[PDB]
Amino acid sequence: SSKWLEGIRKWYYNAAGFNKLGLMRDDTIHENDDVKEAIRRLPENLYNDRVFRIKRALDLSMRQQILPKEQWTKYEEDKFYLEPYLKEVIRERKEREEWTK
Amino acid sequence: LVDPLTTVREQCEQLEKCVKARERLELCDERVSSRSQTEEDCTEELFDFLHARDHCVAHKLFNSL
Amino acid sequence: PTLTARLYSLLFRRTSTFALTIVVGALFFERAFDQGADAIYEHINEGKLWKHIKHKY
Amino acid sequence: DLELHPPSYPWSHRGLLSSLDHTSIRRGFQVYKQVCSSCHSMDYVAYRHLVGVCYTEDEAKALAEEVEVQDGPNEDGEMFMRPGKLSDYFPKPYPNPEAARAANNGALPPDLSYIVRARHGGEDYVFSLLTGYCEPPRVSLREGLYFNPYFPGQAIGMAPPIYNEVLEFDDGTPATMSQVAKDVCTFLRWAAEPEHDHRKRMGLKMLLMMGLLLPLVYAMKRHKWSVLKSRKLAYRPP
Amino acid sequence: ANAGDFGGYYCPCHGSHYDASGRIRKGPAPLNLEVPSYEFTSDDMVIVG
Amino acid sequence: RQFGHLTRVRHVITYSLSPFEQRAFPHYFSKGIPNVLRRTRACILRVAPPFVVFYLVYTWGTQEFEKSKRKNPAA
Amino acid sequence: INIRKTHPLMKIVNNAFIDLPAPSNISSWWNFGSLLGICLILQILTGLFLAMHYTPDTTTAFSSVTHICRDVNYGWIIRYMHANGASMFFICLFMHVGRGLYYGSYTFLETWNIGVILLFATMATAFMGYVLPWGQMSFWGATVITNLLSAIPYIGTNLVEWIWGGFSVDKATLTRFFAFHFIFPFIIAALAMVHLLFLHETGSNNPTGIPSDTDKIPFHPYYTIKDILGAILLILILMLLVLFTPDLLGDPDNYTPANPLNTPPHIKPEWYFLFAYAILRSIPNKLGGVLALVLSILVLVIMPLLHTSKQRSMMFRPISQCMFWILVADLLTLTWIGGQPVEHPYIIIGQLASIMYFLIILVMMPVASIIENNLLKW
Numbered sequence: 001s002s003k004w005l006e007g008i009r010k011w012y013y014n015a016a017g018f019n020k021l022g023l024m025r026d027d028t029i030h031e032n033d034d035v036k037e038a039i040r041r042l043p044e045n046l047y048n049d050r051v052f053r054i055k056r057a058l059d060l061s062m063r064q065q066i067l068p069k070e071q072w073t074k075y076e077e078d079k080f081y082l083e084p085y086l087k088e089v090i091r092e093r094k095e096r097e098e099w100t101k
Numbered sequence: 102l103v104d105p106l107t108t109v110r111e112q113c114e115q116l117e118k119c120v121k122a123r124e125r126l127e128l129c130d131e132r133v134s135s136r137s138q139t140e141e142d143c144t145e146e147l148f149d150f151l152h153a154r155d156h157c158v159a160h161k162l163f164n165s166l
Numbered sequence: 167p168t169l170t171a172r173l174y175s176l177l178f179r180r181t182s183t184f185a186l187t188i189v190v191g192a193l194f195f196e197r198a199f200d201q202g203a204d205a206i207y208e209h210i211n212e213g214k215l216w217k218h219i220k221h222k223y
Numbered sequence: 224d225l226e227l228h229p230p231s232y233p234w235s236h237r238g239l240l241s242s243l244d245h246t247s248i249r250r251g252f253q254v255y256k257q258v259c260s261s262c263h264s265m266d267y268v269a270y271r272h273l274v275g276v277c278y279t280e281d282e283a284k285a286l287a288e289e290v291e292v293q294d295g296p297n298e299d300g301e302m303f304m305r306p307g308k309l310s311d312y313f314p315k316p317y318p319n320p321e322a323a324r325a326a327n328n329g330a331l332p333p334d335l336s337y338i339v340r341a342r343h344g345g346e347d348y349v350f351s352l353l354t355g356y357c358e359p360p361r362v363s364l365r366e367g368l369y370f371n372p373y374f375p376g377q378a379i380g381m382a383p384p385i386y387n388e389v390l391e392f393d394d395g396t397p398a399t400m401s402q403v404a405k406d407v408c409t410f411l412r413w414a415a416e417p418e419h420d421h422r423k424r425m426g427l428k429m430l431l432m433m434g435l436l437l438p439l440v441y442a443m444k445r446h447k448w449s450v451l452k453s454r455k456l457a458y459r460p461p
Numbered sequence: 462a463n464a465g466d467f468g469g470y471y472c473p474c475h476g477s478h479y480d481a482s483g484r485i486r487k488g489p490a491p492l493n494l495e496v497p498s499y500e501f502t503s504d505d506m507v508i509v510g
Numbered sequence: 511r512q513f514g515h516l517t518r519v520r521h522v523i524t525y526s527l528s529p530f531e532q533r534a535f536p537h538y539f540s541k542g543i544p545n546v547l548r549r550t551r552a553c554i555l556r557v558a559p560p561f562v563v564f565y566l567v568y569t570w571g572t573q574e575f576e577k578s579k580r581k582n583p584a585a
Numbered sequence: 586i587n588i589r590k591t592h593p594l595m596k597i598v599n600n601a602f603i604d605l606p607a608p609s610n611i612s613s614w615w616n617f618g619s620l621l622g623i624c625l626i627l628q629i630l631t632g633l634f635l636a637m638h639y640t641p642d643t644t645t646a647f648s649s650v651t652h653i654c655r656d657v658n659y660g661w662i663i664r665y666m667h668a669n670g671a672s673m674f675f676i677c678l679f680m681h682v683g684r685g686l687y688y689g690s691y692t693f694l695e696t697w698n699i700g701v702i703l704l705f706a707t708m709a710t711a712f713m714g715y716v717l718p719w720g721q722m723s724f725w726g727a728t729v730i731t732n733l734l735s736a737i738p739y740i741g742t743n744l745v746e747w748i749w750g751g752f753s754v755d756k757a758t759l760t761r762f763f764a765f766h767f768i769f770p771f772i773i774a775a776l777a778m779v780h781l782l783f784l785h786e787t788g789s790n791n792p793t794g795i796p797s798d799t800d801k802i803p804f805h806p807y808y809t810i811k812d813i814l815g816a817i818l819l820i821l822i823l824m825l826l827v828l829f830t831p832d833l834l835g836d837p838d839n840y841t842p843a844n845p846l847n848t849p850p851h852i853k854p855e856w857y858f859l860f861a862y863a864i865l866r867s868i869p870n871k872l873g874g875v876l877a878l879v880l881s882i883l884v885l886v887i888m889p890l891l892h893t894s895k896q897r898s899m900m901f902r903p904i905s906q907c908m909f910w911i912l913v914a915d916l917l918t919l920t921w922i923g924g925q926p927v928e929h930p931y932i933i934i935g936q937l938a939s940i941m942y943f944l945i946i947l948v949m950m951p952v953a954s955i956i957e958n959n960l961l962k963w
């Protein structure tokens with residue numbers, strides 16, 4: 001029951017493929033004005049690590065080579081870092097909507 | 102004045118599923134000849150055995166020309 | 167490796183020399199390639215073309 | 224009611240760099256001129272096409288001076304016939320389409336320009352048609368229509384013309400059934416594609432060009448993308 | 462003329478099985494055939510239009 | 511979108527060597543063919559199993575179309 | 586300083602062709618813009634030569650085309666180059682639309698709408714051009730698809746006896762189709778430049794879908810020589826088809842002249858409408874069929890307004906990747922059903938293929954995006 005769901009989530013994260021290129025969960029986020037706001041509200045060192053991981057991912061899709069096995073960012077050691085910023089952005093957007101309604 | 106068509110056609114149908122389908126054709130033709138004006142045309146057998154003989158002659162026709 | 171040094175030194179240092187080089191190469195290569203492909207297409211049949219049977223006729 | 228598919232034949236122009244037998248084009252034209260030029264038309268081919276393919280210039284001028292043309296007016300201007308050197312097509316044995324249909328027992332015959340290239344199959348269809356007359360096993364055959372399996376409907380208003388009154392080729396090539404049928408099939412392949420010889424010549428030259436050129440363009444692509452394949456990053460913060 | 466499985470007419474465009482009088486049985490045709498204006502004259506003739 | 515106001519990136523050093531002095535195809539049959547075998551393993555689980563179902567549907571449709579084209583009564 | 590940055594035309598040429606900030610991880614699917622453009626200029630040029638040797642008159646149109654193929658020097662190479670270039674044009678177009686749907690480039694709205702208008706324009710141009718040689722299949726396919734446009738209730742009847750130029754397909758219909766087969770590819774060129782304009786406004790999309798604003802490289806001399814390589818492969822395939830197999834694509838029923846009384850049973854149009862023509866006869870209803878065709882390409886319109894994912898690519902949604910390849914299998918099934926006659930097993934699987942078509946694009950891809958929305962703490 002419990003770990004069966006965990007088995008599904010860990011298998012899907014292995015078979016996604018972005019972990020093989022040195023990415024974490026919040027380096028492949030779709031951008032609207034909300035997520036552009038959340039990226040604008042980041043700290044500095046995480047933003048520098050974000051642009052470095054993105055630049056390595058674009059290099060390793062430029063020569064289309066996957067990282068060796070030992071440097072793949074596995075499940076449950078990644079940072080789910082963008083979640084509170086993006087959460088507050090969506091809360092403020094719904095706040096504007098449901099206030100002007 | 103004998104064409105090589107006749108020679109290689111009568112040669113290639115000698116003993117084969119060609120001959121089995123010819124006897125199947127004679128089965129359906131006797132079946133309708135012992136029947137008062139049925140629908141059974143006995144023609145599908147003609148198509149597939151002459152298909153067989155024409156493939157096997159198609160392998161071995163244009164060499165002798 | 168020395169054979170490409172004088173080639174770079176005489177036909178690739180300039181630009182106009184490079185252009186004259188590829189033009190002269192284009193004409194010479196056009197002649198040689200048309201003769202070669204004509205020889206290949208004659209050799210690949212040798213019994214079917216109109217040319218040899220018409221000078222037999 | 225079925226579709227019998229024609230077989231596959233090892234033609235002498237079957238290979239992708241092979242051409243027609245021009246001698247077979249000559250004797251296939253002899254077949255068309257002897258026996259086939261009374262029901263069928265071939266109105267998109269002139270005698271001047273044959274000036275370099277399977278005849279010389281003088282021979283085609285003789286073959287086009289054998290036939291009247293009915294050229295147009297003169298000074299008084301009714302009409303008048305004409306020998307005609309090269310500017311004439313192959314002249315129309317039956318003038319109108321329905322006059323051709325009423326001359327036959329209905330079912331006017333199609334013209335022989337695009338038959339090879341227009342029958343869901345190559346000249347194998349024409350060969351198996353022209354050679355495959357046989358016995359009808361208990362079918363209708365409405366009073367004039369013959370049986371031949373290589374045709375949709377199995378009822379053809381064409382009397383089988385290929386061996387009946389053999390045409391006696393000029394060269395002395397022995398007139399069997401298969402040889403005269405192969406000759407007229409080669410000639411109909413030629414009348415379908417007048418450019419087959421030179422198009423396979425340019426196909427050979429294009430194969431040599433794209434075998435000699437395209438690896439060099441790929442080399443130059445890799446040579447200009449060679450920098451970004453080898454660029455290497457490093458991370459300096461304080 | 463005389464195609465299909467019902468004996469009668471048959472449209473080869475989208476498999477419309479007509480009957481011998483030309484009426485739609487199996488296909489995407491909603492309507493039947495059109496009956497034109499015909500006038501029989503005793504010369505074994507008919508003016509049709 | 512011009513060229514120079516895209517984003518703001520610090521902390522990144524890039525090395526890249528001249529195109530002439532490096533070779534054109536770097537060990538083209540020592541990394542390339544295991545590379546394309548890697549890419550082939552990572553895809554056909556999601557590429558093939560539609561196509562073979564299409565192929566079976568194709569052959570089944572042809573086979574049953576002929577077998578319902580031909581009836582064979584007996585009388 | 587530089588002529589390339591001050592001259593008013595060369596500002597446009599520099600900002601579109603050299604100093605363009607392009608992403609750095611393009612795979613071979615980003616060639617098909619240049620391939621469609623070079624196919625377009627090739628089709629325009631060969632078509633202009635064909636239009637110099639063509640006489641649109643229903644007595645001598647087919648004889649004029651035969652005159653082109655036999656008597657004019659290399660006119661056969663230009664004719665076969667035009668026809669096979671049209672088929673390769675639609676090959677490159679469907680590769681282009683497949684890239685644009687699969688890598689999530691449909692989050693760009695205005696470029697996508699201009700694209701769909703270009704799709705309609707190329708389809709109408711292909712249909713009019715296929716009418717123009719005035720053959721058997723050309724004549725009857727013109728009749729069938731013009732009656733498809735007559736399926737519109739209460740407006741379509743006068744509309745179709747209008748675009749027939751009368752009450753049947755006549756000299757006027759051939760000359761109308763000639764004039765519009767001439768003028769529509771230049772509208773295709775202008776809308777291609779507007780398409781290019783909005784794409785240069787928004788910015789391109791890399792295969793990852795990660796925004797590549799950190800790693801832009803210029804266009805030249807990288808993508809110029811990559812697209813020269815792609816066009817050289819395209820010219821290889823086009824010369825290969827026009828020099829070895831013209832029989833591979835052309836419908837042999839076409840080559841008989843347009844007898845207005847034959848109607849052969851083999852009645853299929855040219856293959857790149859058969860993914861669409863089989864949608865028509867899947868429905869045993871007229872207005873439902875023509876509306877389902879229009880609604881298929883309007884489903885291609887309303888692709889972005891169902892994008893309920895949270896990562897724009899399909900490289901990291903493997904279930905949507907599987908359903909995409911099931912959709913490609915379904916379209917090739919529809920093409921094969923378009924190439925077959927209309928009887929019982931083909932009718933059953935054509936109905937099921939069209940219903941699975943709309944069920945895959947409309948329903949199951951947003952359902953898969955929702956299940957990976959909900960599976961990854963989003």
Ligand code: HEC
Pocket residue numbers: 258259260261262263327330331332333338342349352353378379380381382384385407
């Ligand atoms: C008059 C008798 C002839 C002669 C001397 C030849 N043909 Fe044939 N032909 C004739 C008719 C009346 C028809 C039409 C039959 C029908 O409408 O079904 C034909 C048909 C053909 C075809 C058509 C096959 C098809 O439509 O798929 C071909 C290819 C053909 N004829 C060839 C042909 C050749 C090569 C001949 C010279 C040997 C020839 N015909 C003689 C009437 C006649």
Ligand code: HEM
Pocket residue numbers: 625628629630632633635636639650664667668670671672674710711714715716717718766767768770771
């Ligand atoms: C404005 C430029 C164009 C002109 C002047 C032009 C002209 C012609 C002409 C005169 C024909 C009839 C000749 C023939 O079919 O043998 C023709 C046929 C055709 N054209 Fe075009 N054309 C143009 C652009 C295009 C484009 C952009 C396409 C689509 C890719 C296209 C697709 C076709 C097709 C499919 C045929 C039928 C070919 C055949 O089956 O023989 N044309 N065109």
Ligand code: HEM
Pocket residue numbers: 614615616617618619621622625678681682685690691693696697698699700701703704707773777780781784788789790791
């Ligand atoms: C008339 C035929 C078409 C031409 C000539 C054409 C041309 C181009 C060109 C030159 C590009 C830029 C190259 C590239 O970005 O890879 C492009 C990109 C694009 N086209 Fe088209 N296009 C055509 C049809 C379509 C259609 C039908 C659509 C779908 C609606 C479409 C959607 C797109 C999209 C989404 C992009 C952006 C891809 C990206 O930059 O990531 N195009 N097109």
